[PDB]
Each structure stands twice: as structure tokens, then as C-alpha cells.
Amino acid sequence: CNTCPEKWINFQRKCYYFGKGTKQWVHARYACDDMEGQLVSIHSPEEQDFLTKHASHTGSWIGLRNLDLKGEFIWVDGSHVDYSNWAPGAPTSRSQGEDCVMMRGSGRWNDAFCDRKLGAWVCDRLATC
Amino acid sequence: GFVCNTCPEKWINFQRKCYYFGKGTKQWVHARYACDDMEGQLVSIHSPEEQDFLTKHASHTGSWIGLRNLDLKGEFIWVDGSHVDYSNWAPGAPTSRSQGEDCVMMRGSGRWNDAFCDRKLGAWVCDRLATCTPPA
Amino acid sequence: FVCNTCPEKWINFQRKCYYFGKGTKQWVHARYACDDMEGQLVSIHSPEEQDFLTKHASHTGSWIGLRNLDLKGEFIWVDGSHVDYSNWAPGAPTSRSQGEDCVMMRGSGRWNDAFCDRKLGAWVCDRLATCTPPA
């Protein structure tokens, strides 16, 4: 079970899309939804390393945010953070309004303002058989 | 760094919950007690992701789930006490004019319909909270 | 996060779970039996832990997870760790090995080296307890 839609890339039981074009966080969410995917969720160092390999050098929106300003970071599939890869000093404690999460070229995570325009974003979905 | 995927034997994990896909003829209330007797509750469903997971494992001939018109106030409420936010009703369900169809079953498609509580179904689904592996 | 959940039939103490097995086994059979239930022959690292084990320890002796690895003269836990805390019986372990390369625990809790092929009626497995999320 590793068949991916055209222009996506397989890793383990998932397919990944590395979108380009300027978007704020929620706009990146809807872009992923338009291709029947979701902004990427990250649950293991293996997956992170795969993501770092293809990652846009200039920063990418990923599927983690401060749901309902609660303020716990929750993946857009409803899953919690088990694996994490924060940049040193991230996430910003409590709590400036940097409520959406981006991934640097290095692969490390940084909490950011949701209205920030980044030039990349990562979607995932389940691979088919 | 805590991974929450531990379930007791015979349960299946999805995110932070564990699920038991029971088999054997039961009416709604008997399914409720079966789930009680094994330290769970009739499943409550809160997201399209949780529903999609349920659909994969769902019995093709229908399963009791933890939703019911209590009591009989006109509102469907989950056994955990929560209200219906996410829903996955089959078209036309629930009736607006109940004559006793006060319990909810999930079809093989995963979609829901209201039903008489003494309907005998071949399946029912329990849930409970998953536990976590400490960071190594 | 509180870590004291055990699978059914195991008992919790602190951050660990314990299984008190019964049935005639050599040390290596008891090792596999623990593996098969997804734990290991117990390793012991504190007095508190020893006190707990002693409360449930089979009167007629139990295999625990300490052994003379390969045959090098060093007793090492199956989890790979060295002996820090210790609770040997008087005159255990034997200075120069005549083959008593495995360790059993008495009802009293105290440890005694023994021939690995000795058949004992009990053995103790452990594993890590799982945790209740903050909810």
C-alpha cells in the first residue's frame, strides 16, 4: 500500500505534497484540503527526516496549530504532539499570538503568526493499494 | 514525547482512544452493559477522522454506538454526556417524528440511523482512553 | 502524565509492572516466557523495588533477570544494566564460578546464584508501566 496520486511522493504508508506559492496558514490548510489532503502531521523522527529532505529551504506551513487558543498545539487531524522537533526556544511559552507552526529548511519547528505569508507548504494523505 | 497508543488486548488504537468491535446479538441496552463490563463505554464519535477509522473496522450489518435520545427529551446525547457536534447521519435520519426510535446504530458505510432500542444487532463498538509510553 | 497502568494480570509498583509467574522452568525457559508476554525477567535497582518483590515473592524461589553474561565473571541484568543495588544472600555469589551462572530470588527476597538448568516453580517478569495523559 504505497500508491500515491500523481505529483505526490510516498513514504511509509503516506503520500506527501510539497506545495509552492504564497499562503497564510489557514490558506495552506484549504489548499491541502483542495487536493483531498491535510497539512502534514509529524509523528516520528523517521518521518521528520524524510520531510527535511524535500523541505522548502525558505520555510513551509505544516499542520500544527494552537487549537482554539487553548493553548496546546494540536495537529489538523485531531492528533496530539508525541514526536516534536522545535527550534531552540520554540514554542513561545505563553503566548504572543504565534499560533501556527512552520517548518524551516533545517526541518525544525517554529511557532509563527497565522497571517504570515510563506512560499511553501506540505500536505499528506494515506497511500492507496 | 509520550506516545499514546497502548490499548488492552483485543482493542484497536486510534489517536488517544481504544476501540473494541464486539460481535454477538444485542439490543442497545445489553450492548451498553457489555461495554461497561469490559471497562469501556459505547463508542462516542467526535470527528471525521475518528469516523473514517470506525468505518474501516465496522461490521457490515450494523453496530450499536453510544448515541441516544435522552430521555426522552428530544436531543441525541452521547453516553459520555457530550452533545452532537460532528455527525454522520444517513439521509433523512434521525426522524423528526419519533415513535420510539431512540437509540443510534452505525451502518456498514459508517453512517448513522436512529433505531428502536430493542432491535437485535450483530455488533456494537466500545471505546476507552488509550495510555501512553513514556519517552525513552 | 502519571505512569502506573499495567496490562491485566500484572501488578504495578512505581513506574513498573510485574508478573509473578508459576510453573516449572529453567532460567532460559523463564526468560522466553517473559519475552512472550512482552516483558523481561525482572531487574532490580532499589530497596523499595526489592521490598515490593519480597511481598509477592514465591516461597520456593524465583528466577530473576541477573546472569553471568556469556561467562565473563560479571553478573549483568537482562535489560543490559550493571549491578548497582544488590541483595545477595550470605555467601552469594560464589568467588570462582563452578557454573552457577544464573540468579534466583528466595521467598525472603535475597539473591542466590544457581545453575541455569535448575528447574524452579516460579519466575518474575517486569516491563514499563503506561501513563495516563493529563486530562
Author numbering:
A (entry chain B): 160 to 288
B (entry chain A): 157 to 292
C (entry chain C): 158 to 292
Give passages from the manuscript.
The second principal receptor for IgE, CD23, is a type II transmembrane glycoprotein with a C-type lectin-like domain (CTLD)4 (3, 4). In its membrane-bound form, CD23 consists of three CTLD “heads” connected to the membrane via a trimeric α-helical coiled-coil “stalk”. The interaction between CD23 and IgE is critical in the regulation of IgE synthesis, which can be up- or down-regulated depending on the oligomerization state of CD23 (2, 9, 10). We have determined the crystal structures of the human lectin-like head domain of CD23 in its Ca2+-free and Ca2+-bound forms, as well as the crystal structure of the Ca2+-bound head domain of CD23 in complex with a subfragment of IgE-Fc consisting of the dimer of Cϵ3 and Cϵ4 domains (Fcϵ3-4).
To verify that the principal site is indeed the location of Ca2+ binding to derCD23 in solution, and to confirm the exact nature of the interaction, several single point mutations in derCD23 were generated: conserved residues were mutated within the principal (E249A and D270A) and auxiliary (S252A and D258A) calcium-binding sites, along with the highly conserved Asn-269 residue (N269A and N269D). As expected, the two principal binding site derCD23 mutants, E249A and D270A, were unable to bind Ca2+. In contrast the E249A (principal site) mutant, which crystallized in yet another form, has cis Pro-250 in all three independent copies. Here also, loop 4 adopts a similar conformation to that observed in the Ca2+-bound derCD23 structure (and conformation 2 of the Ca2+-free and S252A structures). Mutation of the adjacent Glu-249, part of the EPT motif, to alanine appears to have locked Pro-250 into the cis configuration. Thus, of the 30 independent copies of derCD23 presented here, 19 are trans; of the remaining 11, four are cis as a result of the Ca2+ present, and 3 are cis as a result of mutation of the adjacent Glu-249.
